[PDB]
Amino acid sequence: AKLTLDKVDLKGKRVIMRVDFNVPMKNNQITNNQRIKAAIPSIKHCLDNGAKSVVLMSHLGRPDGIPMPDKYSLEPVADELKSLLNKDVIFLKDCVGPEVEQACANPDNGSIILLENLRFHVEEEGKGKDSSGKKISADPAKVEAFRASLSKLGDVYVNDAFGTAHRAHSSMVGVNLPQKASGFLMKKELDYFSKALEKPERPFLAILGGAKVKDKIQLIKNMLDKVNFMIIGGGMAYTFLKELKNMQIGASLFDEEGATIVKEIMEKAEKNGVKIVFPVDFVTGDKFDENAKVGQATIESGIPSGWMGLDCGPESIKINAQIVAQAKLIVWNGPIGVFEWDAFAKGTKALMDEVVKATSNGCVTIIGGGDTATCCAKWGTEDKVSHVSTGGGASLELLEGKILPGVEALSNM
């Protein structure tokens, strides 16, 4: 119910656009430009529809309100965006100030400007830490001035930062312009999770993986009201198996608080006719390390003392392939094992292979932009699944039934 980019008359209008360019870095080098390319459509549309200019703003990492250009500058992003668009990008050393205001005041037609990390100013998040490491709160007056400054950089506001949509930060909800519309990425992201949560294909399978059960209670609960199947993998599994099967999980991390809610979780699944699938076997390590001694175990055998399950085993993989194959809609959020470590990545790799084939057979596959998105890029399956979200935290909120502050701040249709 929000104003969309394609419905705005951008003819000769300066466009101030919030995007999520917080991409994984390494030695000032980008290791994944997905979030960058994801914003291109909105940017191109603006320029192709007569926009006088397009000012881009985003955060990078967590500078906590302290200018750290030596390790958190968006300059590397400006260079990457320039190569992807084959069009010059004016990178400003800041996001506020007389210099920035002048540079965006009335740029030459077709100008693409990229501001510096918004989190170099405490006013963006509203809080942070000083040089000594002490948490500080931004001054109310400063926050208002910061938002008033950013608003002057454009005549029309566009928010395409789906990845940050869950953050009610200044650049996300404080821009005061007559028109505030969603970008192409923002709406594409929203529509996917909308249809999946309102008019889902069936069978409907949800794949949830994570270390703790506590932080996924509301997620699980909401999902059990619409899905037909649900696979729980990752560390959460050991909490369920221990409480439900009285399995000996050895040194496997246990979620004492999450286990208390396991009962009611299984009750709702039963009442909604949702078949929950847990692993039946696993790959163990004699310690929490990539080079740990590798072992094996089943529910019956349990896991030896001092050892922990870090991935599901061969029989579990076979079972997941069976459930994945009988689905027409799949929502995947969270790997099934420690994918970063080869010895415990087989489980997640197999699941990925099955999800890719599921797509080939006509299944709608939606991946939560998080660790699952990392896996897609890692194994090059980004173009083999229906949708790979650019925001894990944002999608999490949506799949929980919560609204996104970055969305609610936009103009209505």
HSE value, Cβ hemisphere, 13 Å, CA-based, for 293:
5
**Per the residue annotation, which of 212, 226, 268, 357 is the catalytic one?**
212
Q: How far apart are alpha carbons 383 and 356 in whole angstroms?
A: 9
The answer as to whether 179 is a domain residue is: yes
Count structural domains, the chain.
2
Is 14 a residue of the active site? no
Query: Are 180 and 254 found together in one domain?
Result: no
Query: Are 161 and 24 found together in one domain?
Result: yes
Q: Phi and psi at residue 281, in whole multiples of 5°? A: -145, 170
Residue at which a domain ends, from 135, 152, 185: 185
Query: Are 204 and 175 found together in one domain?
Result: no
**Per the residue annotation, which of 35, 147, 242, 346 is the catalytic one?**
35
Is 126 a residue of the active site? no
- Binding site members: 19-22, 34-35, 58-59, 61-62, 118-119, 166-167, 210-212, 215-216, 234-235, 309, 334, 336, 339-340, 371-372
- Binding site members for AMP: 211-212, 216, 235, 309, 340
Q: Strand locations in 256-316, DSSP E? A: 275-277, 281-285, 294-298, 308-312
Q: How far apart are alpha carbons 307 and 269 in whole angstroms?
A: 31
Is 212 a residue of the active site? yes
Please, what sign has the CA dihedral across residues 316, 318, 323, 328? positive
Residue at which a domain ends, from 185, 202, 230: 185
Radius of gyration of the chain (CA): 23
**Per the residue annotation, which of 110, 295, 302, 393 is the catalytic one?**
393
The SS3 assignment for 298 reads strand
Query: Are 379 and 294 found together in one domain?
Result: yes
Q: How far apart are alpha carbons 333 and 331 in whole angstroms?
A: 7
Is 12 a residue of the active site? no
CB atoms within 10 A of CB 246: 9
The answer as to whether 408 is a domain residue is: no
CB atoms within 10 A of CB 172: 24
CB within 8 Å of 398: residues ≥ 6 apart: 190, 193, 197, 404
Would you say 351 and 330 are in contact if contact means Cβ atoms under 8 Å apart? no
Q: How far apart are alpha carbons 174 and 203 in whole angstroms?
A: 42
Q: How far apart are alpha carbons 221 and 254 in whole angstroms?
A: 20
Query: Are 218 and 176 found together in one domain?
Result: no
Alpha helices in 199-245 (DSSP H): 217-223, 236-245
HSE value, Cβ hemisphere, 13 Å, CA-based, for 160:
28
Q: Which amino acid is at 10?
A: L
Which among 186, 244, 231, 249 has a CA at the least distance from the CA of 336?
Answer: 231
Q: How far apart are alpha carbons 382 and 369 in whole angstroms?
A: 11
CATH classification of the domain holding 82 = 3.40.50.1260
The answer as to whether 411 is a domain residue is: no
Query: Are 357 and 386 found together in one domain?
Result: yes
Q: Which domain holds residue 223?
A: 192-400
The SS3 assignment for 51 reads coil
Structure tokens that stand for 134 in this block: 């002490």
Method of determination is X-ray
Query: Are 215 and 78 found together in one domain?
Result: no
The answer as to whether 406 is a domain residue is: no
- Binding site members for Mg(2+): 211, 215, 371
List Cα–Cα distances, 50 to 39, 114, 187, 243, 387, in angstroms. Answer: 18, 19, 21, 61, 30
Q: How far apart are alpha carbons 205 and 225 in whole angstroms?
A: 12
Q: How far apart are alpha carbons 68 and 84 in whole angstroms?
A: 26
Query: Are 203 and 255 found together in one domain?
Result: yes
Q: How far apart are alpha carbons 193 and 394 in whole angstroms?
A: 11
Q: How far apart are alpha carbons 77 and 56 in whole angstroms?
A: 11
Q: Strand locations in 275-340, DSSP E? A: 275-277, 281-285, 294-298, 308-312, 329-333
Query: Are 70 and 167 found together in one domain?
Result: yes
Q: What is the dihedral of CA 20, 81, 4, 166, to 10 degrees?
A: 0
Q: Decide the pairing of beta strands 156-159 and 14-18.
A: parallel
Residue at which a domain ends, from 126, 161, 185: 185
Q: How far apart are alpha carbons 314 and 347 in whole angstroms?
A: 8
Query: Are 167 and 85 found together in one domain?
Result: yes
The answer as to whether 413 is a domain residue is: no
The answer as to whether 53 is a domain residue is: yes
Q: How far does Cα 393 stand from its chain's mean position?
A: 5
Number of H helices, E strands in the chain: 17, 19
Which among 318, 313, 285 has a CA at the least distance from the CA of 300?
Answer: 313
Q: What region, left, alpha or beta, does residue 61 occupy, with left being phi > 0 and alpha being psi -120 to 50 degrees?
A: left
Q: How far apart are alpha carbons 308 and 302 in whole angstroms?
A: 10
